[PDB]
């Protein structure tokens with residue numbers, strides 16, 4: 001996960017935050033659809 | 042602070058922001074419950090237990106087709122059968138009794154002192170409830186793709202995405218306990234899914250609030266603004282094209298044109 | 306393993322690598338690219354020192370990763386510090402140069418714009434606007450109350466599974482007009498549609 005400010009707009013910022021969430025949030029352990037953080041990577 | 046909650050006392054609000062209220066503070070094993078202006082009165086406090094029971098004034102909410110008809114009452118908790126005092130609350134705002142699977146708590150009229158009743162579940166705004174102690178409507182902007190804001194257009198008759206402008210009155214929405222999304226300047230007006238279509242999907246517009254099952258919305262954790270239920274549909278910017286001026290009700294797929302943010 | 310790495314690059318093409326403990330979702334250390342130095346918060350977990358940046362000189366900062374400690378060391382609070390594209394660019398540079406004058410301030414910017422935005426859609430959206438209009442903003446109580454209550458909100462979400470979505474305790478949040486909103490259940494969009502990641506407290510289920 002990388003954020004380069006040169007090529008940065010609202011769209012790429014949200015994509016970056018989106019990727020952080022996907023990599024940190026559990027695929028399986030969710031409550032009301034909200035993921036719990038993973039225990040390990 | 043602990044991961045187990047034994048009991049809690051809160052309010053239940055819904056239809057037009059009114060509160061579930063046991064009529065007149067009566068305690069007779071059979072008294073009736075109405076919608077009434079929300080206040081701090083003890084007959085509007087409801088206590089949830091690990092039973093699955095919901096209680097006001099010491100007596101618990103009940104429904105028996107024989108006993109009280111399809112009307113909803115409080116009785117003595119030991120005097121009637123367990124099956125009739127069970128309750129389940131869903132994320133979409135449906136309050137129902139697990140044993141009577143087709144029915145759901147309803148308020149057939151929008152008026153003060155209306156009798157609450159069990160009716161067939163059609164996922165109507167008259168069947169939408171907020172369990173929680175903050176009863177007021179949540180005011181904010183609704184932000185969609187390209188960071189554009191939902192606007193009430195054409196003298197509060199239509200709606201689509203415009204550029205956000207802070208404090209613009211037409212961009213301010215009120216989210217009610219019944220699951221309605223209302224025009225902030227005019228609370229008789231509800232975001233509504235029409236029978237009129239675009240690319241074979243219903244189009245969203247502003248009509249008079251009438252308590253029906255196309256004025257009821259739930260904000261979920263996937264970022265969607267959805268209809269309650271299993272056969273779920275999401276608010277959707279047609280063709281991911283802001284310029285089309287068309288918000289439709291589409292099959293859920295979770296892409297950017299179906300993602301929204303409440304900016305409160 | 307336990308640490309997630311994350312790279313930020315300024316408009317001067319200076320890159321820093323920031324290490325995040327996935328268990329608490331806090332920043333614990335960083336390294337400027339092409340350096341033999343690394344910098345660790347005073348309260349970084351022990352395991353961080355043994356597993357991260359082990360081929361560097363590991364410096365220990367004289368403040369910790371809590372907001373209070375950061376604010377104390379910066380000499381001002383979050384409600385005074387501007388966020389946006391250029392503050393972030395500035396922040397990256399200061400970390401890259403390891404400028405001890407500007408470190409606490411720069412961490413406050415970066416943590417909010419990256420980690421806190423990841424936790425909350427409301428914060429993500431506030432930041433996205435700053436990129437669009439290329440204009441700076443200062444967080445108000447709406448943002449700050451979310452940051453300060455994330456742990457407690459996560460606990461109450463988990464706790465709510467035992468009693469119909471009701472919280473065991475009230476959380477006090479603010480809206481953009483600084484009105485108080487006491488939330489005591491999940492049935493509010495400012496919880497359910499806002500919290501994007503939750504801290505683990507207990508093993509429960511829906």
Ligand SMILES: CO[C@H]1O[C@H](CO)[C@H](O)[C@H](O)[C@H]1O
Pocket residue numbers: 062063064065066077082084154
């Ligand atoms: C004077 O009002 C009283 O009766 C009405 C019923 O009409 C409501 O139940 C209200 O809670 C109660 O205080």
Ligand SMILES: CO[C@H]1O[C@H](CO)[C@H](O)[C@H](O)[C@H]1O
Pocket residue numbers: 239240277278279280281291298
């Ligand atoms: C092919 O589908 C695309 O257009 C339809 C409208 O027909 C919807 O907007 C959908 O979200 C979009 O991906």
